[PDB]
């Protein structure tokens, strides 16, 4: 049993989410429930909501148990950016590039 779930156009920069991705990836497949609820920064609570939705999409698909599952892949890709403007002295302006990301998680019983 394998479930793959993605969350797209998410309101965070992909590189900032890729800091928490390496803390959850690998490490004897034992970082979810171990530190995921207790990890700092706004990126960690985003990937936790995606992971708890991915295992709920496994219970939607087959049977009543999900206790054999672990995370096997966790990656994040760059969403389509928005060129905004904010004026300055004269001006002149700030670039204020607004960004998004696409998060993908895989959960498996193997």
């Amino acid at each position: 049993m394998e479930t793959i779930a993605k969350h797209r156009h998410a309101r965070s920069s992909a590189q900032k989410v890729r800091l928490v991705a390496d803390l959850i990836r690998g490490k004897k497949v034992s970082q979810a429930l171990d530190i995921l609820t207790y990890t700092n920064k706004k990126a960690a609570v985003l990937v936790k909501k995606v992971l708890e939705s991915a295992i709920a999409n496994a219970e939607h698909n087959d049977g009543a148990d999900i206790d054999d599952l672990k995370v096997t892949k966790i990656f994040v890709d760059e969403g389509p950016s928005m060129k905004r403007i904010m004026p300055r002295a004269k001006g002149r302006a700030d670039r204020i590039l607004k960004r998004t990301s696409h998060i993908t998680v895989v959960v498996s019983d193997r």
Partner: protein
């Protein structure tokens, strides 16, 4: 000044060990609380010394 070349992927060294943190070794389990709690400290349902001392 600007980055004239992309660094060898090892040079993030002592930032890479801080890029995501719990900053604690390693949080404790309690018999009447769901989420784990800090050493010498209160749980997310108000338990301290095995007894409930505050309400949420």
């Amino acid at each position: 000044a600007v980055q004239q070349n992309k660094p060898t992927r090892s040079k993030r060294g002592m930032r890479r060990s801080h890029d995501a943190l719990t900053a604690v070794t390693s949080l404790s389990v309690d018999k009447t609380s769901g989420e784990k709690h800090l050493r010498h400290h209160i749980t997310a349902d108000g338990y301290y010394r095995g007894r409930k001392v505050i309400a949420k």
